[PDB]
Design a protein around this ligand. Structure first.
Ligand SMILES: [Zn+2]
Ligand SMILES: [Zn+2]
Ligand SMILES: [Zn+2]
Ligand SMILES: [Zn+2]
Lengths: 370, 370
């Protein structure tokens, strides 16, 4: 009816969340999950999910616990499987007497089914402890489940007066090496990286994660041999990128969003997703919906002003990450985003400053769509 | 040869600096000075300079101390007068046995003259304790003394993509009321406020300090009846501002920088400063030098992109104060500063981010010319 181990429960669930976060570079498309199993006031098993196709966090914790799971309390950051050999029946089979879940399964057709199954077989169950943190841990995955739309981070880098290139086109190092290394850490956590054909034609980028540019913090949780390249997505409405561009010659897969199928021979890692047309342009809303159906949780956008403005105007951006260099390029220089049709101040895209921070000599601004 | 009251000395000099800072809205053109007089380990007199033409900080402290100054230590944030009835002879006349000065007089022809005079008449003197803080307290005044150039703060307000108006000219509230109130607090500390004829023609501003827009912090140190309007300086090369504009109808003085004398009748508070011509434009470097000679310590610049870029390109800006609103106005909108001739990235004005802070829904960025 009520107990007095709330502080202990909070300590173990916080540990389970710490463990879950250790999967964030590699679990895609699965969510990050952690599990801690406590017997007589000491932790006898822990685990987290690391890669799709590997065991769930509860299974790792039960393997550690062994016989010690009999009579133990399990803390899990997400409701255990109900039919996936499922984690619910593994927890019961091990003799767990109590289960605490941070949050219920986000799919409404199966939400609570696991907890009920444990309750049925005599387990004391509850859910909600540190729900808010469990939500934050899988922000992008959860938004995709509940809306069908992947989480879209739009990255911008510009001068103090909002400029991304001189009028001459010269863009060589507005922002700092530190900013580039910071982008690499955020890239490594994204399910996919997305760009436009115009960016690929103008820049010939690789759009990969370089493990050597990662901070010693993230390099400690990310062994080099487990490096996961985010899926590289290229919007190419008119099939102008060639099979000789750097992007499709890196490790990992590359997906081209196309109007119609390309006729050339491409490397094995390159796939085509056919998106329908809206007026003369490839339909951005439909592209995102199809990517959501393909279980793409989060997308890091590296493109120019044209795609940045198009995504903004389609209402598809969830957050802006803006790197500002302490430089003025002047009013003839190129701007941040093209917003065709915008004429009145009150129609302008509006945001909220969440976090601002120094990044080398630059500053980084995190905004959402308020 | 050495002592053991360094901590006590630091405590009293820090109090003297706290007192000095209470003059910062009103002492112009004089520097902020504080004085603390300690007898037998208790403070018997304190003072700070408040307005030009009023007594110096040492005189206020000696008046408080009275007979208790006999045998006392005086802490002063700036070296006492040597011939201005001077503070040096007032300190000696009161029986002070020891004087500690944060810094020497910044004029090299009189630096140290006061301390020597005290030493001559038997006073133990030293200088340098919290010099760095004493310097910071009168940053703008000191730069004007040592270079002839007033301290120039250039204010900018723009959207996230660096825009100051829609293409239509609509500029109504990019930045927030909080940003405007923040500008008022910084304005109130400036010796002068400077603008361009184009700004006055386009905006018809008053360019005054409104006491009602000040934070309860600053309103506590700034009694309403002591309000000092910063000198309003208007650069008008071709005498286009009329005597009917709002700016010359506010309280306090207004100075017009002109190529030749205006022929119309102006209110009593309006004066003309004649600046020579460089090519077809009024000479900005010469204008600043003449203002320095007129003892103008610090200048808060409220103008458009044209004067902002001109001051930047003349190398006259000491710091930028940039208010950024969480809005995107798009690439057809008006920029922050006009930098004619700038084509190569390496020639762009470069800066260092010192301080970044939230100001209501906006952010404020402080930069210097690194
Ligand atoms: Zn109780
Ligand atoms: Zn499971
Ligand atoms: Zn000693
Ligand atoms: Zn004096």
């Amino acid at each position: 009816h009520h107990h007095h181990h709330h502080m202990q429960d909070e300590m173990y669930m916080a540990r389970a969340l710490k463990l879950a976060a250790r999967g964030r570079f590699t679990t895609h498309p699965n969510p990050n999950v952690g599990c801690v199993i406590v017997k007589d006031g000491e932790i006898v098993g822990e685990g987290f999910h690391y890669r799709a196709g590997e065991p769930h966090a509860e299974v790792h914790a039960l393997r550690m616990a062994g016989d010690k799971a009999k009579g133990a309390t399990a803390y899990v950051t997400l409701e255990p499987c109900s039919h996936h050999p499922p984690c619910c029946d593994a927890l019961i089979a091990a003799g767990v007497a109590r289960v605490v879940a941070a949050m219920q399964d986000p799919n409404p057709q199966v939400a609570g089914r696991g907890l009920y199954r444990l309750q049925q077989a005599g387990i004391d169950v509850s859910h909600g402890l540190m729900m808010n943190e469990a939500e934050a841990l899988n922000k992008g995955f959860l938004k995709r489940m509940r809306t069908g739309f992947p989480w879209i981070q739009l990255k911008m880098g510009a001068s103090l007066d909002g400029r991304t290139a001189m009028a001459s086109g010269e863009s060589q190092w507005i922002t700092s090496p530190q900013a580039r290394r910071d982008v690499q850490r955020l890239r490594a956590q994204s399910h996919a990286i997305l760009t436009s054909s115009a960016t690929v034609l103008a820049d010939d980028p690789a759009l990969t994660v370089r493990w050597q540019e990662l901070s010693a913090d993230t390099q400690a949780l990310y062994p080099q041999e487990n490096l996961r390249q985010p899926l590289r997505i290229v919007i190419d409405s008119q099939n102008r990128v060639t099979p000789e561009h750097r992007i499709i010659q890196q490790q990992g897969e590359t997906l081209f969003a196309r109007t119609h199928a390309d006729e050339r021979a491409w490397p094995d890692n390159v796939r085509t997703l056919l998106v329908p047309e809206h007026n003369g342009h490839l339909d951005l809303v439909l592209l995102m919906m199809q990517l959501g159906k393909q279980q793409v949780n989060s997308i890091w956008v590296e493109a120019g002003p044209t795609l940045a403005g198009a995504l903004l105007q389609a209402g598809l951006v969830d957050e802006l990450i803006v790197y500002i260099a302490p430089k003025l390029l002047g009013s003839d220089a190129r701007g941040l985003c093209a917003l065709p049709g915008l004429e009145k101040l009150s129609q302008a895209p509006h945001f909220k400053f969440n976090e601002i921070r120094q990044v080398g000599p630059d500053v980084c601004l995190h905004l959402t769509t308020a």
